[PDB]
Structures are given as structure tokens and as C-alpha cells.
């Protein structure tokens, strides 16, 4: 499993499409694309873990760990104490993978500390916990995020709002970002400010899934039947071939089986 470091605390634009391209790259599989797009790999590729490392001000880090296959966030971890790694795995990873996000996050036996996330990765769970009607009130940004791995990284308690909006910022400033390219223009275009997630940030995010499934079944670049979507200001948005979509889109999720490929 291979670790991507990057500084939030001290950055750049293109430190920051960087990193996102290391994500995308090191995420993506191999051979598979559809239409020019990377897709992620079933299930069985190995490895099957990314690690994304996030180093915040006053020495405060989170690393964060992640599926290929779907790129969603399992967990994360920070240094605590002297010398303890505190793993904390999201309540909906079960079976061999909480081994798996223990072992993966914390490598050494002796020194690895539980701190649950209890509750699921979903969005709307997210936002009650945050106590916020709908991401959107929450702002994003690179000192937002910057700030909220210094809320978390090595306190002793901290509070499920805390938690929850830590969450809502870096799932979309790191895997909501990797997966659109929208979205990490709309965070390079407000990169020295706080900004409100806007409908098609929030859109795109929920419908990805339906999204890679329309490009993967395609013929010719049109599209199996019209993907409607909703844009910036909140305008129903039709879709009818690939070539719409696709500036929007960095990586798709796996389908299995053909698709035309360049």
C-alpha cells in the first residue's frame, strides 16, 4: 500500500493538482479506461488500499485511508501521545477490511490506539452530526481543512460536530476532488478563501456511480438513455453524450466488462 504526502499547512495550486494526479494515478488500475477516463479496479487488484497523508500547522497530521476500487474514505489515524498511531475506522467497514484499516493505518503491533467513528460515511449522516441542513452550509478550503486536522490531530476528546464537519471538508477537498475535476477546479478557483459547496458540486458527487456506468455502456460516445443532472445554480441539467460529462469527470468507477476505450 503506498502512502501520498501532502502539506496542507503550507501549498500551492499546483501542489495541490499534483498530489490529486498522485491520488488518481496510483489509484487508478492499469489497463482499464473507458472514453480516455481511468477506472478503478475490482476489488481484486491488489493492493487494494491507498494512503493519503495529511500534514497540517503546529505539526498536526491525519492519515487518511482509502479503497481503490471506489476511492471512499475506511478511516483515519494520528500520532498520539508519544508514540501511539490512533486509528479510528468509519462504523460501516466490516469483516476482514477493519483488520485490514488497523493493520494498514497503524502497521505496528504495540503501538496502535482505537478511537471508533461511530457513525457511517454517508453524507446525511454527516451533515446531523454537523448539525447543518445540507453540506453547502459548510465551507471548504484549504484553511478550513488545515484548521479542522488541528481540531483533531492529538486532542484527547473532541466532540462528534468536530469529527463530522473534519469529515465533510477532506472526503470532498481529497476524494470528492480525485474522482471531478469540477470539483478541484472549484477548490483552485477559491484557493486563498472559504467557500460554499455550490448544487453541482453536491450533485456530481451523489450521482458518480450512475455516471460511470452511462460512459462505460456507451456506444458511438451517446449515452444509454439521457443522464438528467443539475448545474451550478440549481438548473436541471441534460446529458446526452460522453463528451458533455466527460471535463467534469477524472475517474470511473468499475463496471466490469468492454466499453470503448480510446
Given at each position: 500500500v503506498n502512502t501520498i504526502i501532502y502539506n496542507v499547512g503550507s501549498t500551492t495550486i499546483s501542489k495541490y493538482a499534483t498530489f490529486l494526479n498522485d491520488l488518481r494515478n496510483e489509484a487508478k488500475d492499469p489497463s482499464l479506461k473507458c472514453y480516455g477516463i481511468p477506472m478503478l479496479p475490482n476489488t481484486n487488484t491488489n493492493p487494494k488500499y491507498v494512503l493519503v497523508e495529511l500534514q497540517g500547522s503546529n505539526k498536526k497530521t491525519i492519515t487518511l485511508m482509502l479503497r481503490r476500487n471506489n476511492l471512499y474514505v475506511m478511516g483515519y489515524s494520528d500520532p498520539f501521545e508519544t508514540n501511539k498511531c490512533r486509528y479510528h475506522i468509519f462504523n460501516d467497514i466490516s469483516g476482514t477490511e477493519r483488520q485490514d484499516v488497523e493493520t494498514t493505518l497503524?502497521?505496528?503491533?504495540?503501538?496502535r490506539v482505537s478511537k471508533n467513528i461511530n457513525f457511517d460515511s454517508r453524507y446525511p449522516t454527516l451533515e446531523s452530526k454537523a448539525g447543518?441542513?445540507?453540506?453547502?452550509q459548510v465551507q471548504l478550503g484549504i484553511q478550513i481543512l488545515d484548521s479542522n486536522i488541528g481540531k483533531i490531530s492529538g486532542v484527547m476528546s473532541f466532540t462528534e460536530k468536530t469529527e463530522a464537519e473534519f469529515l465533510l471538508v477532506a472526503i470532498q477537498m481529497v476524494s470528492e476532488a480525485a474522482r471531478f475535476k469540477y470539483i478541484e477546479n472549484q477548490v483552485k478557483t477559491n484557493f486563498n478563501r472559504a467557500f460554499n459547496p455550490n448544487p453541482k458540486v453536491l450533485n456530481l458527487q451523489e450521482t458518480w456511480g450512475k455516471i460511470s456506468t452511462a460512459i462505460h455502456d456507451a456506444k458511438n460516445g451517446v449515452l444509454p438513455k439521457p443522464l438528467e443532472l443539475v448545474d451550478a445554480s440549481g438548473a436541471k441539467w441534460i446529458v446526452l453524450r460522453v463528451d458533455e460529462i466527460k471535463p467534469d469527470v477524472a475517474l470511473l468507477n468499475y463496471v466490469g466488462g468492454s466499453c470503448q476505450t480510446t
Open positions: 497503524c502497521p505496528n503491533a504495540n503501538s447543518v441542513k445540507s453540506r453547502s
